[PDB]
Design a binder for this molecule. Structure first.
Ligand SMILES: CCCCCCCCCCCCCCCCCC(=O)OC[C@H](COP(=O)([O-])OCC(O)COP(=O)([O-])OC[C@@H](COC(=O)CCCCCCCCCCCCCCCCC)OC(=O)CCCCCCCCCCCCCCCCC)OC(=O)CCCCCCCCCCCCCCCCC
Ligand SMILES: CCCCCCCCCCCCCCCCCC(=O)OC[C@H](COP(=O)(O)OCCN)OC(=O)CCCCCCCCCCCCCCCCC
Ligand SMILES: CCCCCCCCCCCCCCCCCC(=O)OC[C@H](COP(=O)(O)OCCN)OC(=O)CCCCCCCCCCCCCCCCC
Ligand SMILES: CCCCCCCCCCCCCCCCCC(=O)OC[C@H](COP(=O)(O)OCCN)OC(=O)CCCCCCCCCCCCCCCCC
Ligand SMILES: CCCCCCCCCCCCCCCCCC(=O)OC[C@H](COP(=O)(O)OCCN)OC(=O)CCCCCCCCCCCCCCCCC
Ligand SMILES: CCCCCCCCCCCCCCCCCC(=O)OC[C@H](COP(=O)(O)OCCN)OC(=O)CCCCCCCCCCCCCCCCC
Ligand SMILES: CCCCCCCCCCCCCCCCCC(=O)OC[C@H](COP(=O)(O)OCCN)OC(=O)CCCCCCCCCCCCCCCCC
Ligand SMILES: C[C@H](CCC(=O)O)[C@H]1CC[C@H]2[C@@H]3[C@H](O)C[C@@H]4C[C@H](O)CC[C@]4(C)[C@H]3C[C@H](O)[C@]12C
Ligand SMILES: *C(=O)CCCCCCCCCCCCC
Ligand SMILES: [Zn+2]
Lengths: 165, 81, 459, 71, 88, 171, 127, 122, 12, 166, 62
């Protein structure tokens, strides 16, 4: 979670500086092509948060839902977790739609610059880490439990179905 | 410096969603005075924009191309030696 | 202990026989040399105390209170140089004489092996303290402050005098070493209930106990800077030191007689901390902070566990440096704006960048940020009171929340925000002011590395 | 700060870009999709299923050793 | 902050450039000195939209106690100039 | 006190902003801003003064019920995300009288120039005091705002802090 | 109901003072009048050695900056820590406690030559 | 889960309680019930420092896999074959502990038939 | 375009 | 044991070097943000070596280097636990912090007190690592309260903003 | 309006409305902008509780 949650804030920070310290998404949009590099990382991270298969976050987030669904757990608590996972996609899509797609609501005279090497490298390294960190850690940490891998077809992809839904 | 403002006689509401507002406010006897003030947001580079599905699919044509060649590349030295 | 008594007496001739323009320099310098020599009192053994003679001795409880006392005198002379600037020379040399005489009574009080010798010097500190408050206070309320500070103490000290003498006629000696071997248990009779109160109420008033604290907001607020520093740094610890000694001869009656005084302290701890949230006077806010902090010492002393005594000693020393520092910081603002109202000068961090750093460090220790000795002492008392009753964690946890609220509120109302527009005489921080704060905090922060020297006899 | 390409803030218009920005921005996007596609191919079990879930309905009363109802 | 400082000439050019897409003020009649009630006769409520147009162009929002007092495209430059410490 | 004209104008200013926050999109803002603009035109010709007030007390109530629960705020206004963000950098100007010479010499032009303003204020102050006392009712001042410079040479009374206020973006 | 005649006059008068005051807030090319700053000869070498662009040599210069950094901030501290650990910490009991290594069947102990018999036969299958 | 609806909305004395799993008599009922073999008896398990819970039955499978990891380092991608072997063994172990669920569930629907047969005999 | 930053005396 | 232990403390010692030098031992304020950023970079590399060894052989050890205070039968020693949780988290936190400081050099470039800001960003990291590698509760409590107070200062960075102090 | 003469010690101190300092015109030119007061204005009995860092009483949408 540290890799991609941190990445989103830096990408969010990039949008803030360009738009003259504007944080309201209701004064943004149409930045998909204006700032392609921030757009790539922001979309990359927003997918990591939502749990795209084989991407840092899937190797931890999805494993939790599989263990949660298949455990002697609390029924209502389980339902809250699954409903929340769906809410992750909704507000994540809110950030992308209101700040990358559509037409730009921001003012006329604005300095939208992204070529600063410090800004790019800071995002770039986490962008690399935001994709490969999950695979590396999951394949190097020694086993410490007996994970559950056999389950009904609907308890092995509920997180994938709900987020897509 | 003496930054130059682009010529103002190029903000055409027609051909943009701001025009459809004129088609609507005409039905009641009124006009949108600031339609040409918002016109710069729909024309030029800002004209059109990828959809949400297209945004996710950014840079997928190349990746799939690498995937197809990559799997085939492994296949070559898979059952050969 | 003559090696520290005689030098302290010789400061008075030094002040009077010094040049008219060198009274502050000479007294400050030689008082620092006496403080340096006090480090020899740390020759403490694990089984026996350092017994000098029939009159004086110094154990691990008296040693930290002696070093803080002798270290505080140099710092009181620096703080007094401003408001004693248009004062005539003879009265300036009388003011220093009172401060020296107060240290002389204090070090002998902390080393008196006889509990009646302890009582005389214990009461002897009232005379110079009263003179400092009433003769060199700035307000009309200083005269009323002295009466409250005088009659609250004597209302409880005189019963102690009778109780101490009654004990001598019964045991045969008030020498502390003898009492450790001749102490007998106290029966549960009405006569011993009032013997308990007489031996304890003299120290509850000075701590002070909640309910019997109304003199502190009047004495600590109307006193000059030197008076407030000693009042809150050492003279409050005279009550704590008294209980730690005299509770030896009150068992097992302290098991139930302490309940009324634990509820006054545990609850009064919350009340006085709450009062600081709404104070309109910066000096008064710090005065009520001492009441909240000293409520822990009363609880620790009255539950009598090895961890409570260790925490109480570290708390008394920790509060001594912090409380004195806060009064000095509050006085630097007063020396400029000449008003104690807290909401009169704001945003001072913009005009005095370095003095704001001292405010932060002072506030953090006040709210017991680890690993400062402020936290070590408070933490140990919390561990001991939990075993005394697991429910006390609710009260001592709520106090932590309130303590952080009023300490940082003090740091936000004066240092942050917008500077006052109509105040234009906020001159930069003098070297005297900056050095005064550095001497409070550096030893306070340094004691963290080797804190066993302030953990008392039960370490 | 930094290199400072100093792309001037233009008035109402599409903001200016640079060759490096688009090339690298598009580069990782290709890598993300390749990484998703590549790992899906080799290990699709970890994303769909590891071992078929055995339905206990399509079983028999003998492998479980259920005693006869008539004793 | 990496935002170039606003020049005094830049503000005035922007002000007119705002008051040239209104479709309610004659482009050939409006100048630096052009009232909204005494010279070109504009609606009072149109000032609010004119003021709102300026705020969305400069970011900072003018209070509704001196914004009402501004009906003179030059005076809008006067107010904006003495809200960003622009002296040249 | 506000005038009945201003109250309607204010409620129009708020309505578009709150209306804008609901719409987000610029195209939908124009389609709906005009309709709100239209509704004011209906009673814009009203000249009753007893039913205009009646509608205004229903105009504010209509606005309140449908006001946004999180209106957009420009990020330097009383409620924005950068309001007073630079007040810690706005040091006064009188603090430079306390600078040390070893560091005052760092800017020989600046402090030589400063003495001009102090002279321009020290000499001008007595004239500024005189002007205010002679343009005020015997009882006392009744409103804000001050007389400007009447003759030549004299600067407006009470000008030092207004002119010399810290720059809004010190650093 | 805009500005009364007085108000416009006052604002312009103040604006004439305000924009002059802000003009005073500029530094002449000499300002600040810095004192005579000494430059170390090591600084002189690199300032004269870099001068022009010469992108090829800047790779080494960063190495010099990193070589010093890896010396005073990594090599010196690790020497102190290793000396501290190897001669003051490890010379006392249980200051450093290691979780004993995971031993497996079919391995040799480097210290005593003991061999742990492998596990029994596996009744395993395919897939 | 799906049988939960059968125990909360539907009947109660049909599903087997997860915390009251078969207390029925011992292996009796299934002729010639065997004993599951253990490979790492006592010391092999307590030499790889296996977690207290991991060494259930497939400890030997786990021990074999952990041997590869300590050896394949830094080739972490390797040993994928051994992990599947250990995973598959636990998959069989999961079904075995899952057979006892249906096994007792049917033994309950059978036990009610005799209970109901005698109840309605009169 | 270097402006003068007004600061409290940092010498003391 | 020596390489694993030595490299697991130099990481904590390296991070403190910029803080110590703030006592005017090497006065280069303009380079301090880059000096602090580079220190995090080298800390990450030194952290990987003990991390890899744990990945290799599961090596894990305690380091009770300094005996601080003994309260009768409670011996409080400054003790560092180098295990799964610390070995894996330490590289991640430093790696993420590495990116943030580089980003801050740009985002916070115009701040008059960027040196002070980079000291506070580094004080938080030190207290976080004390929390992460703490072996006894009191030492954990030191870091636990440490992060809390640094958060207070950083949130109220623009101390003239009444909403930040609140 | 004096506080009620209930004997709690308010004396003849004006009972100003229990309005938070946050409920004051943020654009008006205050003598004390941070506190929103005018020099000489009588101060609320609980001014230190109604400063902008503390209890707020502004109207809420709900
Ligand atoms: C002996 C010390 C000699 C003092 C020499 C000072 C000097 O000349 O340098 C000038 C030095 C830098 O000059 P400057 O740039 O002008 O900054 C001063 C301004 O006021 C601006 O100051 P600031 O706002 O930047 O605050 C600086 C200060 C405080 O800054 C903070 O970060 C606030 C405190 C939060 C710390 C919380 C972390 C948790 C701590 C527990 C972990 C251990 O930093 C520290 O206290 C040390 C860093 C924390 C360690 O001045 C200062 O930093 C402040 C005065 C010195 C205070 C020293 C306090 C610590 C001394 C401890 C010594 C004893 C060891 C204690 C061990 C036990 C630990 C509890
Ligand atoms: C063992 C104790 C060793 C320390 C002895 C006590 C130290 C006393 C403090 C140092 C002396 C002092 O206070 O400084 C004063 C003195 C200079 O003062 P002075 O020469 O009198 O200036 C006016 C002359 N018309 O300072 C000097 O002259 C020092 C040269
Ligand atoms: C252990 C437990 C500790 C318990 C402590 C309880 C509190 C102790 C008493 C605190 C006394 C507070 C200070 C005295 C009050 C005061 O400050 O004076 C107020 C009042 C004003 O009178 P005055 O000053 O003379 O005239 C105005 C001049 N400007 O003064 C007066 O008008 C009258 C003053 C009366 C004299 C004060 C008496 C002090 C208390 C002892 C009284 C004797 C006790 C009873 C004796 C036996 C029974 C009669
Ligand atoms: C506010 C109002 C406060 C009201 C306080 C009233 C106190 C006066 C009543 C207390 C009397 C106590 C007493 O006289 O004890 C007598 C007892 C006799 O001793 P003994 O002969 O050995 O008894 C053996 C019998 N088989 O003697 C003893 O054994 C112990 C005597 C100890 C000395 C007692 C001192 C007086 C107690 C004062 C209580 C504290 C009050 C503090 C506030 C000041 C008043
Ligand atoms: C503003 C004034 C501030 C200064 C106040 C000074 C303190 C007030 C005086 C306190 C006097 C001591 C209290 C005891 C009075 C004498 C009676 C007594 O001692 O009885 C002892 C009794 C022994 O019997 P027992 O309880 O069965 O023994 C086992 C207990 N563990 O054991 C017990 O009964 C336990 C103790 C009983 C006391 C109960 C007290 C409850 C109230 C606590 C809050 C105090 C409120 C003070 C009010 C001030 C106004
Ligand atoms: C507001 C009023 C709050 C105080 C209420 C006091 C109630 C005391 C009580 O009834 O016991 C509660 C709690 C239960 O603990 P238990 O282990 O069940 O032992 C039985 C103790 N009666 O007794 C305890 O053990 C104390 C538990 C302390 C919990 C602290 C929680 C802090 C919350 C912030
Ligand atoms: C729960 C715990 C919470 C603790 C919180 C405390 C916070 C306070 C701040 C923490 C300070 C951390 C730094 C501590 C490092 C150790 C300092 C030291 O070296 O002290 C001497 C130490 C020996 O101490 P030791 O034998 O363990 O017993 C001490 C009993 N008091 O070491 C030695 O034996 C001395 C040998 C040094 C060898 C190195 C020599 C080269 C060094 C060059 C430096 C220049
Ligand atoms: C290596 C690093 C980055 C420069 C680069 O791109 O290589 C540079 C930036 C500023 C440098 C530091 C600063 O110059 C301050 C110190 C100067 C002395 O040479 C000791 C090391 C010292 C702490 C330097 C170490 C290192 O060379 C630094 C940290
Ligand atoms: C066993 O415990 C099942 C728990 C699963 C709870 C989530 C159910 C979600 C079902 C959504 C309807 C999908 C129908 C195909
Ligand atoms: Zn003074």
């Amino acid at each position: 979670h540290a890799f991609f949650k941190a990445m989103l804030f830096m990408c969010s920070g990039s949008i803030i500086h360009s738009l003259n310290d504007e944080q309201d998404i209701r004064k943004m949009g149409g930045l998909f092509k204006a700032m392609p590099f921030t757009t790539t990382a922001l979309i990359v991270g927003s997918l990591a948060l939502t749990g795209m298969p084989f991407l840092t976050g899937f190797y931890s987030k999805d494993l939790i839902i599989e263990a949660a669904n298949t455990s002697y757990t609390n029924a209502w608590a389980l339902l809250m977790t699954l409903i929340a996972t769906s809410f992750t996609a909704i507000y994540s899509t809110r950030i992308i739609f209101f700040a990358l797609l559509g037409q730009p609501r921001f003012p006329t005279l604005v300095n939208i610059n992204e070529n600063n090497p410090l800004l790019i490298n800071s995002i770039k390294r986490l962008l690399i880490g935001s994709l490969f960190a999950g695979y590396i850690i999951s394949n190097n940490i020694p086993p410490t439990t007996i994970p559950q891998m056999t389950m009904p077809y609907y308890l092995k992809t509920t997180a994938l179905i709900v987020t897509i839904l | 410096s003496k930054m130059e403002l682009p010529d103002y006689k190029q903000w055409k509401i027609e051909g943009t969603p701001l025009e459809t507002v004129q088609e609507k406010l005409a039905a009641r006897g009124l006009r949108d005075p600031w339609g040409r003030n918002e016109a710069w947001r729909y024309m030029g580079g800002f004209a059109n924009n990828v959809s949400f599905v297209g945004a996710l699919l950014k840079g997928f044509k190349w990746g799939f191309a690498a995937f197809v060649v990559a799997i085939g590349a492994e296949y070559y030295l898979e059952s050969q030696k | 202990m003559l090696k520290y008594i005689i030098p302290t007496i010789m400061l008075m001739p030094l002040t009077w026989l010094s040049k008219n323009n060198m009274i502050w320099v000479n007294s400050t310098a030689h008082s620092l040399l006496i403080s340096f020599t006090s480090l020899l009192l740390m020759n403490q053994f694990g089984d026996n105390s350092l017994n000098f003679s029939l009159l004086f001795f110094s154990d691990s409880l008296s040693t930290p209170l002696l070093i803080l006392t002798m270290w505080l005198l140099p710092l009181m002379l620096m703080a007094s140089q401003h408001h004693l600037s248009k004062e005539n020379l003879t009265r300036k040399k009388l003011f220093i004489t009172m401060l020296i005489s107060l240290q002389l009574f204090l070090i002998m009080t902390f080393t008196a092996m006889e509990l009646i010798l302890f009582y005389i010097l214990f009461e002897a500190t009232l005379v110079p303290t009263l003179i400092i408050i009433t003769r060199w206070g700035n307000q009309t309320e200083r005269l009323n402050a002295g009466l409250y500070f005088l009659f609250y103490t004597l209302a409880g000290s005189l019963p102690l005098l009778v109780a101490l003498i009654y004990i001598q006629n019964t045991v045969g000696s008030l020498n502390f070493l003898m009492l450790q071997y001749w102490v007998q248990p106290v029966h549960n009779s009405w006569s011993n209930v009032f013997m308990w109160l007489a031996c304890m109420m003299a120290f509850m008033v000075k701590m002070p106990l909640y309910g019997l604290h109304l003199w502190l907001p009047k004495a600590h607020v109307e006193a000059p800077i030197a008076g407030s520093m000693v009042l809150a740094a050492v003279l409050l610890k005279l009550g704590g030191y008294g209980m730690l000694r005299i509770t030896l001869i009150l068992n097992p009656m302290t098991d139930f007689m302490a309940y009324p005084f634990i509820m006054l302290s545990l609850w009064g701890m919350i009340m006085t901390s709450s009062i600081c949230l709404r104070q309109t006077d910066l000096k008064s806010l710090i005065a009520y902070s001492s009441v909240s902090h000293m409520a822990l010492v009363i609880v620790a002393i009255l539950i009598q566990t090895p961890w409570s005594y260790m925490g109480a000693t570290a708390l008394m020393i920790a509060h001594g440096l912090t409380s004195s520092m806060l009064f000095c910081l509050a006085n630097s603002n007063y020396e400029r704006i000449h008003s104690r109202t807290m909401i009169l000068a704001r945003g001072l961090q913009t005009l005095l960048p370095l003095m704001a750093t001292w405010w932060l460090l002072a506030s953090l220790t006040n709210l017991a940020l680890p690993p400062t000795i402020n936290l070590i002492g408070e933490l140990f008392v919390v561990m001991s009171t939990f075993s005394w009753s697991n429910i006390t964690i609710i009260l001592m946890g709520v106090n932590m929340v309130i303590t952080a609220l009023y300490s940082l509120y003090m740091l936000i109302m004066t240092q942050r925000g917008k500077y006052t527009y109509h105040i234009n005489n906020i001159s930069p921080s003098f070297t005297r002011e900056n050095a005064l704060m550095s001497l409070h905090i550096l030893p306070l922060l340094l004691l963290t590395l080797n804190p066993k020297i302030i953990l008392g006899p039960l370490y | 700060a930094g290199g400072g390409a100093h792309i001037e803030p233009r008035y109402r218009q599409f903001p200016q870009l640079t060759r490096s920005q688009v090339i690298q921005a598009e580069f990782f996007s290709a890598t993300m999709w390749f990484w998703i596609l590549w790992r899906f191919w080799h290990d699709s079990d970890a994303v769909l299923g590891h071992f078929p879930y055995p339905d206990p309905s399509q079983w028999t009363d003998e492998e479980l050793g259920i005693p006869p109802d008539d004793e | 902050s990496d935002a170039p400082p606003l020049t005094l000439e830049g503000i005035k050019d922007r002000v007119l450039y705002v008051l040239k897409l209104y479709d309610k003020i004659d482009p050939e009649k409006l100048s630096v000195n052009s009232h909204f009630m005494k010279d070109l006769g504009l609606d009072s409520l149109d000032q609010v939209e004119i003021i709102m147009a300026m705020e969305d162009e400069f970011g900072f929002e003018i209070p509704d106690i001196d914004a009402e007092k501004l009906m003179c495209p030059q005076e809008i430059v006067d107010y904006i100039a003495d809200k960003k410490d622009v002296y040249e | 006190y506000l005038t009945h004209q201003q109250k309607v104008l204010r409620l129009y200013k708020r309505a578009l902003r709150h209306l804008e926050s609901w719409c987000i999109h610029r195209d939908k803002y124009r389609y709906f801003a005009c309709l709100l603009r239209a509704r004011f035109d209906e009673h814009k010709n009203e000249k009753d003064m007893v039913k205009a007030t009646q509608l205004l007390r229903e105009a504010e109530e209509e606005f309140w019920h449908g006001q946004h629960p999180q209106p957009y705020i420009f990020p330097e206004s009383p409620g924005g995300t950068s309001y007073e963000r630079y007040e810690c950098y706005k040091v006064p100007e009188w603090c430079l009288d306390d600078w040390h010479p070893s560091e005052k010499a760092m800017y020989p032009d600046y402090f030589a120039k400063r003495e001009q303003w102090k002279k321009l204020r020290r000499e001008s102050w007595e004239r500024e005091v005189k002007q205010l006392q002679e343009e005020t009712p015997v009882g006392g001042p009744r409103t804000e705002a001050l007389p400007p410079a009447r003759k030549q040479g004299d600067l407006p009374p009470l000008w030092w802090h207004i002119v010399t206020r810290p720059r809004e973006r010190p650093m | 109901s805009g500005y009364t005649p007085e108000e416009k006059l006052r604002l312009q008068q103040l604006r004439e003072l305000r924009r002059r005051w802000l003009k005073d807030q500029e530094l002449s090319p000499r300002e600040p009048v810095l004192p005579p700053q000494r430059v170390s000869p090591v600084e002189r070498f690199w300032n004269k050695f870099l001068q022009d662009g010469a992108l090829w040599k800047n790779v080494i210069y960063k190495t010099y900056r990193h070589s010093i950094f890896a010396f005073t901030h990594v090599l010196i501290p690790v020497w102190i820590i290793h000396y501290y650990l190897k001669y003051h910490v490890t010379t006392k009991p249980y200051t450093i406690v290691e979780k004993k290594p995971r031993i497996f069947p079919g391995d040799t102990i480097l210290e005593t030559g003991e061999v742990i018999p492998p596990m029994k036969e596996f009744p395993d299958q395919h897939h | 889960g799906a049988h939960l609806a059968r125990r909360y909305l539907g009947d109660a004395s049909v599903e087997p309680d997860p915390l009251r799993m078969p207390t029925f008599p011992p292996d009796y009922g299934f002729p010639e019930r065997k004993e599951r073999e253990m490979v790492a008896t006592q010391q092999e398990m307590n030499d790889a420092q296996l977690v207290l819970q991991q060494r259930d039955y497939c400890a030997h499978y786990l021990i074999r896999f952990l041997k590869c990891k300590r050896d394949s380092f830094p080739n972490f991608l390797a040993c994928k074959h051994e992990r599947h072997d250990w995973d598959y063994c636990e998959h069989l172990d999961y079904v075995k502990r899952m057979k006892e669920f249906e096994r007792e569930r049917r033994l309950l629907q059978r036990k009610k038939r005799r209970e109901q047969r005698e109840a309605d005999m009169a | 375009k270097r402006l003068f930053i007004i600061k409290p005396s940092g010498f003391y | 044991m020596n390489m694993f232990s030595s490299l697991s403390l130099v990481t904590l010692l390296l991070l403190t070097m910029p803080i110590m030098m703030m006592s005017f031992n090497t006065y280069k304020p303009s380079n301090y943000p880059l000096y602090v950023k580079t220190a995090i970079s080298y800390a990450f590399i030194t952290s990987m070596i003990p991390t890899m060894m744990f990945i290799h052989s599961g090596q894990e050890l305690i380091i009770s280097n300094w005996h601080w205070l003994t309260i009768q039968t409670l011996k409080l020693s400054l003790s560092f636990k180098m295990d799964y949780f610390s070995m894996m988290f330490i590289p991640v936190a430093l790696f993420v912090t590495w990116s943030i400081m580089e980003f801050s050099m740009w985002y916070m470039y115009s701040d008059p007190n960027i040196n002070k800001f980079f000291k506070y960003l580094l004080l938080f990291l030190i207290t976080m690592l004390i929390l992460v590698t703490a072996n006894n509760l009191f030492q954990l409590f030191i870091g636990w309260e440490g992060v809390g107070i640094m958060s207070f200062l950083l949130i109220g960075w623009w101390y003239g903003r009444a909403d930040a102090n609140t | 309006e004096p506080y009620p003469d209930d004997g709690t010690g308010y004396g003849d101190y004006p009972k100003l409305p229990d309005r938070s300092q946050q409920e004051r015109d943020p654009w008006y030119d205050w003598d004390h902008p941070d506190l929103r007061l005018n020099w000489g204005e009588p101060m609320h009995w609980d001014l230190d509780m109604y400063i902008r860092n503390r209890v707020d009483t502004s109207p809420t949408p709900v």
